[PDB]
């Protein structure tokens, strides 16, 4: 998904990385890459949108860690 690209590359749904310019100057392309990196915005659901992970997997992971900490705090309450 990342390296294989031709004339256009969309690694995450909100960012497009074009191919190097025809004029082929490394300074200008460096500036262009830095600018297009700066213009990006990272959404709150980046872990599921920017990555290829489904939302269900992220929710399942959050639920698993929540139940783990809930079990630990339940036990600690018994420990007194």
Curated annotation (Swiss-Prot):
It comes from the Eukaryota. Cytoplasmic dynein acts as a motor for the intracellular retrograde motility of vesicles and organelles along microtubules. Dynein has ATPase activity; the force-producing power stroke is thought to occur on release of ADP. Required to maintain uniform nuclear distribution in hyphae. May play an important role in the proper orientation of the mitotic spindle into the budding daughter cell yeast. Probably required for normal progression of the cell cycle. Dynein heavy chains probably consist of an N-terminal stem (which binds cargo and interacts with other dynein components), and the head or motor domain. The motor contains six tandemly-linked AAA domains in the head, which form a ring. A stalk-like structure (formed by two of the coiled coil domains) protrudes between AAA 4 and AAA 5 and terminates in a microtubule-binding site. A seventh domain may also contribute to this ring; it is not clear whether the N-terminus or the C-terminus forms this extra domain. The dynein complex consists of at least two heavy chains and a number of intermediate and light chains. Interacts with DYN3. Belongs to the dynein heavy chain family. It is found in: Cytoplasm, Cytoskeleton. The chain holds residues 4013 to 4092 of 4092 of the full protein. This is Dynein heavy chain, cytoplasmic. It comes from Saccharomyces cerevisiae (strain ATCC 204508 / S288c). Present with 195 molecules/cell in log phase SD medium.
């Amino acid at each position: 998904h990342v390296f294989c690209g031709s004339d256009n590359l969309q690694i995450v749904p909100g960012v497009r990385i074009p191919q190097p310019l025809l004029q082929q100057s490394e300074e200008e392309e460096r500036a262009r890459l830095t600018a297009i990196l700066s213009n990006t915005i990272e959404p709150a659901d980046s872990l599921s949108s920017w990555l290829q992970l489904p939302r269900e997997s992220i929710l399942n992971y959050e639920r698993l860690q929540a139940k783990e900490v809930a079990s630990s705090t339940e036990q600690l309450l018994q420990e007194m």
